[PDB]
Structure 1
């Protein structure tokens, strides 16, 4: 029991560390997605202006 308890505690702590790293990774990805979304929506505004001018011309 003692040996197995030791090993289980060790591996669980390992998993905890990996999970924290995953948290940080997810934060990075979320920020970058926000950036790309802003770029795309502004791009859409540009396309709207493009098409409107094209129609007029």
Structure 2
């Protein structure tokens, strides 16, 4: 009785584990893409700051 109890319970544990794992790797993809996005924003900001200081010296 207790054996089949724990067995079904922990097979469902492996179920939520597969789900939480899928969400984990999806969040890893999210993390890497967000690093790339903030890196693109970093080059955006470096470029715009160079432009700002150059053109402000001009002004």
* TM-score (structure 1 length as normaliser): 0.83
The one of 12, 16, 20 equivalent to 1:18 is 16
Cα RMSD, aligned residues only:
1.0
1:27 maps onto 2:25 in alignment: yes
In structure 2, runs of 5+ residues without a counterpart are none
Residue matched to 1:50: 48
Q: Distance in 2 between matches of 1:30 and 1:18?
A: 18
* TM-score (structure 2 length as normaliser): 0.80
What number of residue pairs does the alignment pair up? Answer: 55
